[PDB]
Design an enzyme around this catalytic site. Structure first.
Site, short mmCIF file in Angstrom:
data_model
loop_
_atom_site.label_atom_id
_atom_site.label_comp_id
_atom_site.label_asym_id
_atom_site.label_seq_id
_atom_site.Cartn_x
_atom_site.Cartn_y
_atom_site.Cartn_z
N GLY A 191 -13.78 -3.10 -0.66
CA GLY A 191 -15.18 -2.74 -0.43
C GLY A 191 -15.74 -1.64 -1.32
O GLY A 191 -16.92 -1.67 -1.68
N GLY B 96 -11.16 -9.62 -4.21
CA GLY B 96 -10.16 -10.43 -3.53
C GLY B 96 -9.83 -11.80 -4.08
O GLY B 96 -8.68 -12.03 -4.42
N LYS C 291 -21.57 -18.23 -2.50
CA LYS C 291 -22.97 -17.99 -2.20
C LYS C 291 -23.68 -17.08 -3.17
O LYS C 291 -23.06 -16.33 -3.92
CB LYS C 291 -23.10 -17.42 -0.75
CG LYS C 291 -22.80 -18.44 0.33
CD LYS C 291 -22.17 -17.82 1.55
CE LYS C 291 -21.75 -18.89 2.52
NZ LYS C 291 -22.36 -18.69 3.87
N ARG D 267 0.83 -1.23 0.00
CA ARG D 267 0.00 0.00 0.00
C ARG D 267 0.86 1.27 0.00
O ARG D 267 0.46 2.27 -0.60
CB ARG D 267 -0.97 0.04 1.18
CG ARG D 267 -2.13 -0.94 1.03
CD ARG D 267 -3.14 -0.82 2.13
NE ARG D 267 -3.81 -2.11 2.35
CZ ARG D 267 -5.03 -2.26 2.86
NH1 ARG D 267 -5.74 -1.20 3.23
NH2 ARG D 267 -5.54 -3.47 3.02
#
Ligand SMILES: O=C1N[C@H](c2ccc([N+](=O)[O-])o2)Nc2sc3c(c21)CCCC3
Length: 416
Positions: free
Chosen positions: A396, A373, A215, A39
């Protein structure tokens, strides 16, 4: 709009300015030692550009850890200043706070064209707008508290550069309250916005979304939003068994079944028909007699189904052959989800062939974007990051953007 935002490369007046830069320095720190510097390294093109252009001061603001709106020195950004210094080959001044007259005096007193890192923004309850004190009681910043903190941050410099796309989905003080005339994206944010705009706003068609994952439930918002944009959609991975069971009453054995998500399958299929979207579900599967890489395996078609006590862990050979025409005929591709249990090499074949086809389409002129991810992990494990047009690191924020959610940090940038 995503692609009409002012970027650091468009900013003409940099020499002699105090440039405030919001960066993403949320790195893991173990006993004052940074365990992953990626980062920090990622911010070097922004910092160097401002150095090369002759900015008077390069003032970095960021957050790390979980201070929850009070000063908690466990989450100090002091080690990041040391690491950044080593990477820049010059001393980085570290300040104990991020607002106030003392901070302003130290910045003004600092060497011309130098880099300054201010303390963790989230030590202030006004950054997130709410927090939890040391005792564990909920604390909240009032409207006036928020406005004061944002005015104090605005007072730090002349030009604002937001290079923290990973926080742009939050309506936080450093994302929406820095009211400078010039608010432009840094190099990282600029590439995120440029490629998501290419993918979602007037894309080169056919536009394909490749969705996968364990899912159905956690992907409903993502699927429904993408059905408003795409021409074609591959649905694979563990979520496909729920679709096969609902739509075709396919026997799935001990394969993953999403009880809550199963109730939404018809709505999703009904929306794809209404939006004239071609859906590509697997028609065969690599099944296993145990959840293990060394299980006994075989291929079963969607007509045979999966016998009791067996489980589908990857797309079958016919499904994999079906990817070819779909992927190679697509001019824009958004891939968010592996097509099988790729962590187990015997169940990675479907995801690897998908990657090879995406690379081939990219080489022939398609724009490929990898969203999240697990898909990013597969591309990294296969060493193919340089063969994809864009591998997002927005976490996110990338998922929210693809779900069609508002990104307050993007909204707050200046227009081109
Ligand atoms: O935890 C699991 N996830 C995997 C999964 C993810 C993606 C796919 N796919 O098939 O592509 O399957 N499939 C099964 S069976 C199974 C489990 C999982 C847990 C233990 C009982 C049997």
């Amino acid at each position: 709009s995503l692609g009409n935002k002012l970027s650091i490369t468009d900013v003409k007046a940099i020499q002699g300015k105090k440039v405030l830069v919001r960066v993403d320095f949320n790195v893991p720190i173990e006993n004052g030692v940074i365990k992953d510097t990626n980062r920090i390294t990622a911010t070097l093109p922004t910092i160097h550009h401002l150095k090369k252009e002759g900015a008077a001061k390069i003032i970095l603001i960021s957050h790390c850890g979980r201070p929850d709106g009070t000063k908690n020195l466990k989450y100090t950004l002091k080690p990041v200043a040391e690491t950044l210094g080593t990477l820049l080959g010059e001393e980085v001044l570290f300040l104990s706070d991020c607002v106030g007259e003392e901070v302003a005096a130290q910045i003004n007193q600092a060497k011309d064209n130098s880099v300054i890192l201010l303390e963790n923004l989230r030590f202030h309850v006004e950054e997130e707008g709410k927090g939890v004190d040391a005792a564990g009681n909920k604390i909240k910043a009032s409207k006036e508290d928020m406005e004061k903190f944002q005015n104090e941050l605005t007072k730090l410099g002349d030009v604002f550069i937001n290079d923290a796309f990973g926080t742009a989905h939050r309506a936080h003080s450093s994302m929406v309250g820095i009211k400078m005339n010039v608010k432009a994206s840094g190099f990282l944010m600029k590439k995120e916005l440029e490629y998501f705009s290419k993918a979602l706003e007037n894309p080169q068609r056919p536009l394909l979304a490749i969705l996968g994952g364990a899912k159905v439930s956690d992907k409903i918002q993502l699927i429904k939003n993408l059905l408003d944009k795409v021409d074609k959609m591959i649905i694979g991975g563990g979520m496909a068994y729920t679709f096969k069971y609902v739509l075709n009453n396919m026997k799935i054995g001990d394969s993953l079944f999403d009880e809550a998500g199963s109730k939404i399958v018809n709505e999703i299929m009904e929306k794809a028909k209404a939006k004239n979207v071609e859906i590509y579900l697997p028609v065969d599967f690599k099944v296993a007699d145990k959840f293990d890489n060394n299980a006994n395996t075989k291929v079963v078609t969607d007509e045979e189904g999966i016998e009791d006590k067996w489980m589908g862990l990857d797309a079958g050979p016919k499904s994999i052959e079906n990817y070819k025409d779909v992927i190679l005929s697509s001019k824009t591709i958004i891939w968010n989800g592996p097509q099988g249990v790729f962590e187990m090499p015997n169940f990675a074949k479907g995801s690897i062939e998908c990657l090879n086809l995406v690379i081939e389409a990219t080489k022939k002129g398609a724009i490929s974007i990898v969203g999240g991810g697990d898909t990013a992990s597969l591309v990294e494990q296969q060493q193919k990051k340089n063969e994809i047009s864009h591998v997002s690191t927005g976490g996110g924020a990338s998922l929210e953007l693809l779900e069609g959610k508002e990104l307050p940090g993007v909204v707050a940038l200046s227009s081109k």
